[PDB]
Amino acid sequence: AMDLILINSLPLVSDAETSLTCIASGWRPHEPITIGRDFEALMNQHQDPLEVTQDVTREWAKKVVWKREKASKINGAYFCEGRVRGEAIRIRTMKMRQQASFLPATLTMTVDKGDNVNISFKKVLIKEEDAVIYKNGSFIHSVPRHEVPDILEVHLPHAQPQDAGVYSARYIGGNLFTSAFTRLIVRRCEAQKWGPECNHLCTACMNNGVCHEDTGECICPPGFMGRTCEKACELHTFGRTCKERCSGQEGCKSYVFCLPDPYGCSCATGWKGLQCNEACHPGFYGPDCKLRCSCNNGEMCDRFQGCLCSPGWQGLQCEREGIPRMTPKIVDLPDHIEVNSGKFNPICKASGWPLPTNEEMTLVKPDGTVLHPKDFNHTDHFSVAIFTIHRILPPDSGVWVCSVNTVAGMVEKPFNISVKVLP
């Protein structure tokens, strides 16, 4: 009910057209998806109204496209929000002149409340004048004329939540419309910790997924899925259940994905660099190609999925044996149900080797509500969660969804429920 993905079709702007697509994956939003300028993220921004149209190539998705070469001052922090039952899901990104004097090095960067941050921009144009690094509008750092190095950094020792935000960089004689932008995302808890008091141990996320401080659950990079981000998805896909496909004969090449906040932006698995147009050198494979393969026996290292193990061996480095994993599978779920108003007790049934446990099965209502099982049991090799709805009413009828997520991956199956009242 909350799998929103913003696609920043090239964060570096030039003469070609650039866009921003906000996508709802596997759920009909019940409140308008929003796309616009994030004035709080960066001040002194222009206020031209954005033209937001429906992207007819992805079910539920909205996009903003900027007229080729009419790509005037569109530099700035943007965002696309999704509202689900009172909760807002926000994802942010920025746009900047490709012609820039300094390039951002990285679009966004995530650190822990402890972490000693090191914000850096790469020098592109050599001008004989002072270089400055701002933050939204205020001063942060400054470098003297004849001493502006090949890499312009700001050192943030012991980064705190307040240190998060958009960091600008440019030569003193410039302006906002010509700065380089970088977003620092600071988790409110230290590494592996989560909870209202950072009192809990996160789910170990592999393949560069990050742990959400308010849930302990992982947000995986495009191309992987499963509770711990270890399931390599089908080649050019994205979305929590990997049911979205990068349009184009070139995969997800020129696509930049930004996911819900604790994660930020990055390339899909197998690609790197701003623009994400660069493939990976041998031995690497995750998002922005930061993962180093280490296949214990020299097994193939695929830039998208990682180590390609031989018969009998699973795992990130082909270090495990035993029963091989099986992605969950929703079995025996009708396309329609038709039920009368009153007590309702639906069941979702799933298979898979790591057999879904009770904490991994949920039923999502058309309006986003997420229900947990009330009773549970598993047969020979099928998990069965049973849900209880006090009094299902007529308006609640729509497309409900069974959701199962384990280390073998995640799956969702939709079924249409019709509710009428007995005469």
Ligand SMILES: CC(=O)N[C@@H]1[C@@H](O)[C@H](O)[C@@H](CO)O[C@@H]1O
């Ligand atoms: C008003 C202004 O231009 N500054 C905003 C400020 O409102 C906000 O508290 C801060 C938080 O990101 O962002 C900017 O600094």
Ligand SMILES: CC(=O)N[C@@H]1[C@@H](O)[C@H](O)[C@@H](CO)O[C@@H]1O
């Ligand atoms: C096949 C299996 O073991 N499932 C049983 C099912 O027979 C029954 O309807 C339910 C009772 O609440 O318990 C489990 O779901």
Ligand SMILES: CC(=O)N[C@@H]1[C@@H](O)[C@H](O)[C@@H](CO)O[C@@H]1O
């Ligand atoms: C939510 C949806 O997919 N709409 C269909 C609706 O058109 C159809 O009339 C009903 C019963 O026939 O099933 C679903 O509700």
Ligand SMILES: CC(=O)N[C@@H]1[C@@H](O)[C@H](O)[C@@H](CO)O[C@@H]1O
């Ligand atoms: C109220 C109702 O259920 N009718 C809808 C009808 O509007 C639509 O044309 C058809 C196609 O999906 O589905 C259902 O028949």
Ligand SMILES: *[C@@H]1O[C@H](CO)[C@@H](O)[C@H](O)[C@H]1NC(C)=O
């Ligand atoms: C950031 O710069 C400091 C200062 O030299 C350095 O000690 C630190 O390792 C850098 N951070 C990293 C690891 O990129």
